[PDB]
Design a protein around this ligand. Structure first.
Ligand SMILES: CC(C)=CCC/C(C)=C/CC/C=C/COP(=O)(O)OP(=O)(O)O
Ligand SMILES: [Mg+2]
Ligand SMILES: [Mg+2]
Ligand SMILES: [Mg+2]
Lengths: 321, 135
């Protein structure tokens, strides 16, 4: 019944999403459409909208905030897939493959441009302070991730930092900016804000877990993609610590000497060690963030909207619950 | 060197010092001299220089420098947005975000034209994209 309440809005933002991409440029219109047509769970607008519906209020700002977040989210994906060399997206070809590198970079900046155009209406420094801050942070996270490739060890703090910027904060901004465009009170804003942050953390851990556990079918790319590109994630970290407990530090030695030119045999070894030793601690950690998000949901006033958020919390974190 | 130039060069040098994958190419000398004399705040001049350099870096993106250059154009875009947000320069924001949209449009259409005069004219429009609205 939650896809019924957001039904009129999801189709509204979708309509405006296609409006925002209209361009007198031939390729860009095609390219923008290409990724905008590609799947999309629109989970960020769903947080924006629901966060604004916590208190009794109506604004045209609310639904247009959601539109902008999606545009920024998709702007990051186009650029991402070109940087990461990915050729697939939920079963759809990536823009740099379907078109070329130049189009891929242009369309990314184009989406960011229109996303910022869309919210330029909202005359509010705090709003833009928050939004521009998270965008900067996402970049910072990407810089750190790129420098952390094939560089062991990665501290637990640095890992949390990494997954915070690349997933958690944009979702936290969704709940925060949504709460602003509805003048929600500080007590209720804090809880939904921390809900968004914790749900994003938990979700990104799950994603990192799936990189090891799942098959190429639900991934769309080889199992162990993160480590094959040098990315050290908590599942690997946890697996290493467990083996050291059993006095076995061979995995540690292998990862330390890991290089961009490493043989597939070394990756296959790493993958299986992670599957055997790193999955459960990663699930445990993910659960902590999930349970923390539940607490913040339970502390906000009982209402209809609360139930929708709770049902999204069950869906997104199903792999751990 | 103006005040605004010191401001952005300080912030960029801090980024290169902190994030090794941020690469800072030189600002366009012609666009600096023009921005110097623009009748706007220190913050708007920074945003202009940031977003201008961002888009110009677009042309230098290889396969050998992409995991550096792509992200670097994105902080420069994020900086641009950061410079116009506290306080919120609404008018300058609407103008320049439009410029960002249009300059990407002109660069696409540029890829599909060989005519001589049409090339010289569109390039002119692309080079001066972010400073014309202020003249
Ligand atoms: C232009 C802009 C707004 C921001 C630029 C900064 C960029 C590109 C951020 C990328 C956002 C992160 C996506 C997840 O990365 P992953 O771990 O590679 O995710 P998957 O494996 O799904 O690709
Ligand atoms: Mg990436
Ligand atoms: Mg990627
Ligand atoms: Mg991943």
């Amino acid at each position: 019944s939650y896809k019924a309440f957001l039904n009129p809005y999801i189709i509204e933002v979708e309509k405006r999403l296609y409006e925002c991409i209209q361009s007198d440029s031939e390729t860009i219109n095609k390219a923008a459409h290409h990724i905008l047509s590609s799947g999309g769970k629109r989970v960020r607008p769903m947080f924006v909208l629901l966060s604004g519906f916590l208190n009794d209020t109506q604004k045209d700002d609310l639904i247009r905030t959601a539109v902008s977040l999606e545009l920024v989210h998709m702007a990051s994906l186009v650029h991402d897939d070109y940087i990461d060399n990915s050729d697939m997206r939920r079963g759809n070809t990536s823009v740099h493959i379907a078109f070329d590198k130049d189009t891929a970079i242009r369309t990314g900046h184009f989406l960011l441009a229109r996303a910022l155009q869309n919210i330029a209406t909202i005359n509010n420094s705090k709003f833009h302070q928050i939004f521009s801050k998270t965008i900067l942070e996402v970049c910072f996270g990407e810089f750190d991730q790129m420098a952390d490739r094939f560089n062991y060890p990665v501290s637990f703090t640095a890992y949390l930092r990494r997954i915070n910027r690349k997933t958690a904060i944009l979702i936290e901004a969704s709940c925060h900016l949504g709460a602003l465009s509805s003048q929600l009170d500080e007590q209720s804003t804090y809880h939904i804000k921390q809900f968004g942050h914790c749900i994003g953390m938990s979700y990104q851990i799950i994603d990192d877990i799936l990189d090891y556990t799942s098959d190429e079918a639900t991934l769309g790319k080889p199992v162990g993609s993160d480590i094959r590109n040098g990315h050290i994630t908590y599942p690997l970290m946890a697996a290493i610590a467990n083996l050291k407990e059993q006095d076995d530090d061979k995995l540690e030695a292998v990862v330390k000497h890991l290089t961009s030119t490493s043989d597939d045999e070394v990756y296959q070894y790493i993958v299986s060690q992670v599957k055997q030793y790193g999955i459960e601690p990663a699930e445990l950690l993910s659960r902590k963030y999930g349970d923390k998000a539940k607490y913040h949901l339970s502390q906000l006033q009982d209402s209809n909207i609360k139930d929708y958020l709770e049902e999204i919390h069950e869906k997104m974190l199903k792999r751990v619950y | 060197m103006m005040r605004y130039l010191h401001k952005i060069e300080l912030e960029l040098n801090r980024l290169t010092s902190r994030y090794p994958f941020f690469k800072k190419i030189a600002f366009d000398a012609e666009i600096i001299k023009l921005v110097d004399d623009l009748n706007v705040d220190e913050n708007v001049k920074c945003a202009i220089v940031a977003i201008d350099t961002s888009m110009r870096m677009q042309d230098f993106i290889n396969e050998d420098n992409k995991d550096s250059f792509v992200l670097s154009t994105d902080v420069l875009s994020a900086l641009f947005y950061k410079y116009l947000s506290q306080p919120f320069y609404q008018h300058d924001f609407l103008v320049l975000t439009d410029c960002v949209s249009r300059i990407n449009e002109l660069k696409s259409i540029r890829a599909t034209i060989t005519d001589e005069i049409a090339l010289h004219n569109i390039n002119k429009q692309i080079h001066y994209m972010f400073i014309q609205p202020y003249m």
